[PDB]
Amino acid sequence: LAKTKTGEMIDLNFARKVVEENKRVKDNRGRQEIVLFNGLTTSKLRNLLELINHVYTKVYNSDDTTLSEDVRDELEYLKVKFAYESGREPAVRTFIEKTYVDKLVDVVLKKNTKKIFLDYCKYFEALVAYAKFYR
Amino acid sequence: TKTGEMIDLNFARKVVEENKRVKDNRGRQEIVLFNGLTTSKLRNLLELINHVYTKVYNSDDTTLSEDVRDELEYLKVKFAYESGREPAVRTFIEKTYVDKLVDVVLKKNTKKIFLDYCKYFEALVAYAKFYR
Amino acid sequence: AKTKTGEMIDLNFARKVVEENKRVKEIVLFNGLTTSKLRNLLELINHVYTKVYNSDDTTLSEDVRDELEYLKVKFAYESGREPAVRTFIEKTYVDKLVDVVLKKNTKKIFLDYCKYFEALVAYAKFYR
Amino acid sequence: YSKIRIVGKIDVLTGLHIGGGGETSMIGAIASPVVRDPYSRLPIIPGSSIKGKMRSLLAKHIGLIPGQKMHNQDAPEILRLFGSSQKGAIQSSRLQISDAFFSKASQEEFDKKDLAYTETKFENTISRLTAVANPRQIERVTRGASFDFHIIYNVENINEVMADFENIKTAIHLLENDYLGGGGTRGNGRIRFVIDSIDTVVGDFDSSNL
Amino acid sequence: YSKIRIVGKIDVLTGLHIGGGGETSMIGAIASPVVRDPYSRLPIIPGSSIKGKMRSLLAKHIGLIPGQKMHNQDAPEILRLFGSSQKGAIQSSRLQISDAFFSKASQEEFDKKDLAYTETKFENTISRLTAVANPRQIERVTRGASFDFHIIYNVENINEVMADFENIKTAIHLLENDYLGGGGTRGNGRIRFVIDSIDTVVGDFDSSNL
RNA sequence: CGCUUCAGCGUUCUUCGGAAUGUCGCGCAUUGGCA
RNA sequence: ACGAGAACAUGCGCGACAUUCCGAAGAACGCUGAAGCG
C-alpha cells in the first residue's frame, strides 16, 4: 500500500494497531463507555466508508489498471470531503490525522494504479471493521 | 489449542458438541451452537474460505502467493468484523481459534497448511450441520 | 472389526446388512438411500483407494490418514444432509471402520475396508 | 434433420440481477454481484437462467400434477421441447438456448452517455415492530441495456414444429410478462424479447411461416 | 496410401464444459470440473468428444434406421469415415480426430487481461413442489478461448475422398450449429471452426481442391 | 444546526441415472494323422 | 567309452476394433433506505 511517517508500515495489522491505540475504556457511571478516537462514533466512520465505497465500485467496474481521470477527480473530491468532515467534527479530524487517510489517498493518486486504490479501500474497510469489533 | 489441546477434525467435532446445548422449549428441542450461531453465518464464513481456497488451489507453488496472503489478511479483518456484529460469531471464533489459525497459515506460508485449515473449517461446518 | 451384539464385519456381513435393511414397498434400502449417494460415498473411498493403491508401503502414510479423517468429515456432512445416508452409515458402521483403519494404520486393513465398502455397493445393486 | 436458428435481442425494461457467487464484498459494497462474462467483464444473461424461467413458466401454464417432485415429471410438450432424463424415457431437448451477451450497439450507446453498465441500488428491510432496518446494496443491469440471444431448434419430428414453436412463443410471452433473475416482486428483471430473424440454418425445413 | 492433415482452431463462443471426474473439493466449492491436460493443467477438448459429437450429428443428418441399437448400424458413409466393428464388415476409420489443446495465443491473450481460463458458473435447480433452490457450481472454459485441433484423414479409396470431405464439411457445419461438451442445451460449449491448412502430409494425393 | 443507529439477515451448497458393453479368447508350421 | 552324440519351443504374428463422462436442472426465496428528533 504505502508508508506513513517515520517509515511505519500501513497494513491491516497496522489498522488494528491504530484503532487499539486510540481505544480506551473511560468507564462512566459504573458502566463501560467505549471511546474511539476521542468521541468518534460509528456513524462518522460509516459515512467516510461510503465516501470510499462510491469510487471503490467505480474503479471495480473498470477493467484497466490505470486510474482514469474520472477516478483522479473523484479522489480529489474525496480529499476535499475528508478535509471538510475533519473541520466539521473534532472527532473526525482526530480519526483522519491518526489514520493518515489523506496521505494514503495522495499516495493512491501518485501511483495511479488499481491495486494501490484497492489496498487503500481495504485499509479503510479494515479500520471500520476493527472499530466495529472493539466497540 | 489452549490447554495443550491439538487442533484437528476430531477437535472440531468436540468443539461443536461441547458447545451444543439442547435448550428444550415448549417440549421441543432447540439445539444452539456457540450461543445461538445460525448456519447462515457459518456459510458466509465458509464462502470467504471457499473464495480463498479456490484462489490457492488454482495456484501451483506450495508457497502461497502474495494474492493469497492478502486474502488471509482480509479474512482476519472479516473475522474481526463479524465477531463484533454478532456475539455468537465472536464466541465461535474464540472457541474454534479459526482467526488464530489464519495467522498460523500465514506464518507457514504453504499450501498444505492452508488446505489443512480449509479441512478444519469444513469439519466445523459439517459437524455443525450434523449435530443440528 | 466387530459390531454391536458381537457380530463380525465381513463381506458376508455386507450381504447380510444390505439384506436386513432391504424393505419392499420399489426396493428401499436404509430408509430411502439412493444409488447416487452410495456412488458418491464410493467416489470418496475410491479417491482414497487410488491414493493407497498407487503406494506400495503397508503402513498408511500421513496424507492418506488425513484423507481418511476427511472421509469421516464427509460421512458426517452427508449424514447431516440426508437421513438415509445417516441410517446407512450407522447400520453399516462405515465411519467406525474408518476409525478402526486409522487405529490399525496398515494397507491391508484399508484395502479390506475398501472391499467391504465395494461389497456393500455391489449387494445394494444386486438386491434392488 | 434440420437446425433452425433464432436470433434476437433481450432489452431490460428494469434493472436485472442474475447473481453469481465466488466474489468477496468490501463492507458497505455490492454484496450480491451480477453474473458477468469473464472475458469482457460485461453483464450477461445465462442460457440456463432463460431456459429455467421459460420452462418453469410454461410448466405452470400447462399445469402441474399434484405432488410433482421432479422436473422429469412434466407435460409431454415440455418434456419434448426442453428435454428429459426419465429412466427409460430419455427424451432430447429441441431447444439450445444460449448465453445472451452484452450487445455492442448498447455498449457503445452506454459509453456515449457516460453510463456504467451496472447500477447500484440501496435497499433495506425494516422490522414491522422494532422499526429497526438492516440495509443492503444490490447490483443490477442498467435499464435500456440490450442482450442478443441465440436459440437453436432441432427438428426431431417435422410434423411437430408448428406446435413446438407455438409453445416457444407462449413461453416468450410468459417470460416477457414475468421477471427474470432477481425477484420481480421487488421489480428487478423486467425484460423485452424482440426477434430479428428465424431461418433453418441446416437442412431443408421451411421456417418462413414461423 | 495417403495421409491428409487438417489443422485449425476451435473458438469457444459460449463457455465450454466437458466433464471430467475424479476430483474431490471442499464443501461449497466447485462441484463439477472440466477435462484438463494433467501436464499443463490447462483445459482440453478430447478427440473422443469431437469425434462422438461429429459422428452423432452426421448419423442423425444422414438418417437413423428405424429401431437402430448400435453405432455399427450407422450409414455406410459414417462407418467408412469414423470406423466400424461389425462382424465380418470391420471398416477402418479414415478420420483420426485428436485432442484439442489450449492454444498458446489464447493463453497469452488471457494472461494479457489477467483472466483465468476457467470460470465457475453458479447455477441452481428450483424444485417444482417445494420451490427450494439447490445450488451447483460448474466449471467452464472462458468464452474467447481457442483450441487448435488436429485431424488425420487416411485416403484408402481415391474415388471417395471428395465425398468423405463433403461429409466432414457437413459434420463440422452441424457441430458449429450445435454444441460441444455438457450443458450445451442450456447454453454451453458453442464453438466455431477455423480451418488453417488442409495438406497431404503422406503420399502423393492432391489436396488442393479440398 | 444536523445527529444517532442499522449494513446485510434467515435458508438451500448439488440432485437424480448410467458405472462399462459388444467382438476376438490364440492361429499356423514342424511333431501327430493319413497315405 | 553314460540309449548315447549333436539338435534354440522356435518362426510370423499391434490387446485391437465401435464408443460424446452425457441426460434433466432459473443463483432465487423473503426483505419500504428506514426509525427517533433534537
mmCIF file of C-alpha atoms in Angstrom, chain D residues 1 3-5 19-22 35-40 46-48 51 55-56 59-60 64 67-71 73-74 82 93 95-99 101 150 152 154 201-202, chain E residues 13-15 53 57 60-62 109-110 113 115-116 119-123 125-130 136 140 142-145 170 173-174 176-179 184-188 190:
data_model
loop_
_atom_site.group_PDB
_atom_site.id
_atom_site.type_symbol
_atom_site.label_atom_id
_atom_site.label_comp_id
_atom_site.label_asym_id
_atom_site.label_seq_id
_atom_site.Cartn_x
_atom_site.Cartn_y
_atom_site.Cartn_z
ATOM 1 C CA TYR D 1 -32.617 -33.294 -39.879
ATOM 2 C CA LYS D 3 -31.359 -26.916 -37.267
ATOM 3 C CA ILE D 4 -33.221 -23.592 -37.089
ATOM 4 C CA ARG D 5 -31.510 -20.522 -35.621
ATOM 5 C CA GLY D 19 -26.376 -13.409 -9.444
ATOM 6 C CA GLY D 20 -23.057 -15.167 -9.448
ATOM 7 C CA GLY D 21 -21.181 -16.275 -6.363
ATOM 8 C CA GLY D 22 -17.486 -16.506 -5.633
ATOM 9 C CA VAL D 35 -23.254 -12.626 -13.394
ATOM 10 C CA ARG D 36 -20.721 -11.299 -15.888
ATOM 11 C CA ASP D 37 -18.835 -12.709 -18.839
ATOM 12 C CA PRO D 38 -15.226 -13.031 -17.601
ATOM 13 C CA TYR D 39 -13.674 -12.040 -20.936
ATOM 14 C CA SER D 40 -15.257 -8.617 -21.471
ATOM 15 C CA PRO D 46 -27.147 -17.115 -18.799
ATOM 16 C CA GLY D 47 -28.800 -19.546 -21.224
ATOM 17 C CA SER D 48 -29.668 -21.816 -18.277
ATOM 18 C CA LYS D 51 -34.355 -21.857 -20.150
ATOM 19 C CA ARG D 55 -39.589 -23.984 -18.824
ATOM 20 C CA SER D 56 -40.909 -23.194 -15.345
ATOM 21 C CA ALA D 59 -44.936 -25.820 -16.940
ATOM 22 C CA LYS D 60 -47.053 -23.677 -14.623
ATOM 23 C CA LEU D 64 -48.637 -29.429 -12.751
ATOM 24 C CA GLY D 67 -47.140 -33.603 -5.669
ATOM 25 C CA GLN D 68 -44.903 -33.024 -8.704
ATOM 26 C CA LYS D 69 -41.498 -33.731 -7.175
ATOM 27 C CA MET D 70 -39.342 -33.854 -10.313
ATOM 28 C CA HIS D 71 -38.759 -31.848 -13.464
ATOM 29 C CA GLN D 73 -42.490 -35.212 -14.367
ATOM 30 C CA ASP D 74 -43.830 -32.546 -16.726
ATOM 31 C CA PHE D 82 -36.887 -28.887 -23.157
ATOM 32 C CA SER D 93 -34.112 -31.132 -25.820
ATOM 33 C CA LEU D 95 -34.117 -26.027 -27.531
ATOM 34 C CA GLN D 96 -30.483 -24.932 -27.236
ATOM 35 C CA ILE D 97 -30.953 -21.514 -25.643
ATOM 36 C CA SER D 98 -27.532 -19.905 -25.267
ATOM 37 C CA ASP D 99 -25.929 -17.135 -23.240
ATOM 38 C CA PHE D 101 -24.075 -11.494 -24.315
ATOM 39 C CA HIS D 150 -29.229 -17.371 -29.974
ATOM 40 C CA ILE D 152 -31.154 -23.388 -31.833
ATOM 41 C CA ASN D 154 -33.585 -29.170 -33.657
ATOM 42 C CA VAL D 201 -29.504 -22.844 -40.982
ATOM 43 C CA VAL D 202 -29.121 -26.585 -41.561
ATOM 44 C CA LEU E 13 -18.236 -18.829 -28.478
ATOM 45 C CA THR E 14 -20.018 -19.840 -25.257
ATOM 46 C CA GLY E 15 -18.438 -21.280 -22.140
ATOM 47 C CA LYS E 53 -20.390 -35.312 -31.428
ATOM 48 C CA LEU E 57 -24.713 -35.307 -35.745
ATOM 49 C CA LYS E 60 -28.658 -38.019 -37.439
ATOM 50 C CA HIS E 61 -28.407 -35.947 -40.626
ATOM 51 C CA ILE E 62 -27.885 -38.896 -42.980
ATOM 52 C CA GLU E 109 -4.184 -13.293 -24.635
ATOM 53 C CA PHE E 110 -5.762 -14.367 -21.339
ATOM 54 C CA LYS E 113 -6.037 -9.472 -19.377
ATOM 55 C CA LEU E 115 -8.013 -13.635 -16.761
ATOM 56 C CA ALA E 116 -8.497 -17.248 -15.727
ATOM 57 C CA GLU E 119 -14.857 -19.703 -14.835
ATOM 58 C CA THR E 120 -17.063 -21.090 -12.066
ATOM 59 C CA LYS E 121 -20.658 -20.717 -13.204
ATOM 60 C CA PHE E 122 -23.153 -20.638 -10.338
ATOM 61 C CA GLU E 123 -26.480 -22.322 -11.072
ATOM 62 C CA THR E 125 -32.378 -26.049 -9.502
ATOM 63 C CA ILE E 126 -35.768 -24.851 -8.270
ATOM 64 C CA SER E 127 -37.906 -27.758 -7.093
ATOM 65 C CA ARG E 128 -41.372 -27.978 -8.601
ATOM 66 C CA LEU E 129 -43.299 -28.792 -5.373
ATOM 67 C CA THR E 130 -41.178 -27.017 -2.705
ATOM 68 C CA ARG E 136 -24.364 -26.137 -8.114
ATOM 69 C CA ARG E 140 -16.489 -23.860 -17.810
ATOM 70 C CA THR E 142 -13.991 -18.906 -20.620
ATOM 71 C CA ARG E 143 -15.501 -17.603 -23.891
ATOM 72 C CA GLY E 144 -12.833 -16.128 -26.212
ATOM 73 C CA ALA E 145 -10.556 -19.151 -25.781
ATOM 74 C CA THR E 170 -21.282 -31.193 -43.317
ATOM 75 C CA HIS E 173 -21.139 -27.292 -40.106
ATOM 76 C CA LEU E 174 -23.558 -29.261 -37.915
ATOM 77 C CA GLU E 176 -20.799 -25.304 -35.447
ATOM 78 C CA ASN E 177 -24.626 -25.111 -35.452
ATOM 79 C CA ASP E 178 -24.517 -27.410 -32.389
ATOM 80 C CA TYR E 179 -22.669 -27.503 -29.064
ATOM 81 C CA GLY E 184 -24.984 -27.160 -24.230
ATOM 82 C CA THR E 185 -28.799 -27.234 -24.290
ATOM 83 C CA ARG E 186 -28.649 -24.569 -21.557
ATOM 84 C CA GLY E 187 -26.066 -22.500 -23.408
ATOM 85 C CA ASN E 188 -22.674 -24.179 -23.125
ATOM 86 C CA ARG E 190 -20.875 -23.280 -28.587
#
